[PDB]
């Protein structure tokens, strides 16, 4: 449970290839925008298909 050798810079950067995170499913809000993530109520106008329900 003890590291025998230190990790080099290149192996660390190769391990950090998949550490990035993705862009969310964000779309144009039909009321005002911009923008609104899919299948959630818009935080700006408080509308959802298409009534102001807050």
């Amino acid at each position: 449970a003890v590291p025998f050798r230190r990790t080099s810079k290149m192996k660390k950067r190769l391990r950090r290839t998949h550490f990035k995170l993705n862009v969310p499913g964000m779309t144009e809000c039909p009321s005002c925008g911009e923008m609104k993530l899919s299948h959630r109520v818009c935080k700006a106008c408080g509308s959802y298909n298409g009534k102001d329900i807050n």
Partner: protein, 119 residues
Amino acid sequence: SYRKLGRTSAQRKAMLRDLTTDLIINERIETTETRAKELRSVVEKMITLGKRGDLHARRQAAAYIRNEVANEENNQDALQKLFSDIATRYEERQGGYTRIMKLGPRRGDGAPMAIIELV
């Protein structure tokens, strides 16, 4: 299979009763999404219990509704509110008395929040 929601079964029952009654008075509450999904079936089952209107269904509902005041300056309990307003409002509708609308994640823990309302 139902969710456990990170609680003991007694804590699960107490939290579900609290959320059911609080939805029944305030008519719109904001919880997490999985709590909403676990809550909506119980809430529509209790509305279905309120549909019957007899004494046995009311005594079944009294074992689940907590004793909090529903309507101020009227001394109406929540158990009276199910059998006076909600049952008469949803007499024609057959199921689907609640809807869940998702919000963004919470600041403190990244919890996806949801709006629950009686429709």
